[PDB]
Structure formats: structure tokens, C-alpha cells
Amino acid sequence: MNIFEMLRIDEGLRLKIYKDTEGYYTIGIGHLLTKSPSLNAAKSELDKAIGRNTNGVITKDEAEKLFNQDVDAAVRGILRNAKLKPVYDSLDAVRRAALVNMVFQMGETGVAGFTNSLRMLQQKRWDEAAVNLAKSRWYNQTPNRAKRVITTFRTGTWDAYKNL
Ligand SMILES: [Cl-]
Ligand SMILES: [Cl-]
Ligand SMILES: [K+]
């Protein structure tokens, strides 16, 4: 198990534009295209991202290319954020991946706002952080996924993703 495998399970793989859990056009492995309700607008973002006039369908290789970029960008975002970096640096590699997962799903800004949870994580108060993390729109809207990520922070193991 690793960040790529983890997110691949959480986000799935779809080669044609589809709507994510929030109703937003996306493609590939969770690559958000736009929050706009315009399919045309989503298609234009797709072409710009891939570098060719696609017509809304991409190949697996292309999906993986964006995914790698996206994971790298999430890590980049954490490292540049004053609220997230210290937490990230304080964690073991397994827990680090859980934080990258959250940023990939909600963005740097979103996660940086979980101030109290972040503090509990930095303090290594695992069970308390897990309870706190669940008190969120994130958990309520995507509870099974959230639960997986939370168990990862709670235990520092990949048990929630084993057998998937
Ligand atoms: Cl992009
Ligand atoms: Cl879910
Ligand atoms: K998805």
C-alpha cells in the first residue's frame, strides 16, 4: 500500500468525464476539472490539461499522468502551507499519506482549516484526533472514505485499505 494505491481505491478510474460526489465534472482518478455546471467549460479544462482536443475521453495512461501530477501537487501544497507543513513533518509515512489524501480531496485551504484536528494530530493524540475529524462536513458527506482515512490516522497502518 502507498498514496497512489490508496487514492486509486478512493477515487476509482473513469476515462470519460463524469460528476464527482459533489456533482462536479471530473475525469480519470479523481481529477477535478471545474466546479462550473457547464460541460463545455469542463471539456475545455480537460483539453488544456491533456494538451489535445479530446472530446471528453482520455486513455488510462493519460489518466495516470494527471494523477501523478495531482498527487505531486498535493504534496507541494502541504509543504508550502504554514499550517500544514509542520503537521506533515511530524507524521510517520503512513499518516502522511492520509493527510495527502485529504488535501487531494478537499484542497490545501480546506484541510488547513481543520485547526483543532491538526493540533491533535501534531500532539499524537490519535483517538481524540479521529473523533474530532469525524465532526465535519467531510465525514458526513463521504463517510466510508472518511472513515478509511481516519482509521489510517488513528492507527498508522493500512488496515482500512487492506482487502479492497
Ligand atoms: Cl492540470
Ligand atoms: Cl464515502
Ligand atoms: K471519484
Catalytic residue at 20? yes
CA of residue 164 to ligand 2 center, whole Å: 14
The binding site consists of 32, 104, 117, 132
List 5, 10, 11, 61, catalytic entry: 11
How many helices (H) does the chain have, and how many strands (E)? 9, 3
Distance CA 118, CA 108 (A): 13
CA of residue 55 to ligand 3 center, whole Å: 20
Neighbours of 110 (CB within 10 A): 14
Distance CA 150, CA 146 (A): 6
Catalytic residue at 62? no
User: Does residue 1 sit in helix, strand or coil?
Assistant: coil
Question: Which residues is 16 bridged to in the sheet?
Answer: 57
Resolution at which this structure was determined, Å:
1.5
Method: X-ray
Which option is the CATH number for 1-164: 3.40.50.720, 3.40.630.30, 3.30.420.40, 1.10.530.40? 1.10.530.40
Q: Which ligand is located closest to the Cα atom of residue 13? A: 3
Strands 14-19 and 25-28: antiparallel
Distance CA 48, CA 85 (A): 30
Which grid coordinates belong to 21? 460526489
Q: Provide the H-helix boundaries in 60-92.
A: 60-79, 85-90
Distance CA 71, CA 63 (A): 12
Identify the CA nearest to 66 among candidates 58, 56, 54.
Answer: 58
- Burial (CB < 10 A; 0-12, 13-18, 19+), residue 127, is exposed
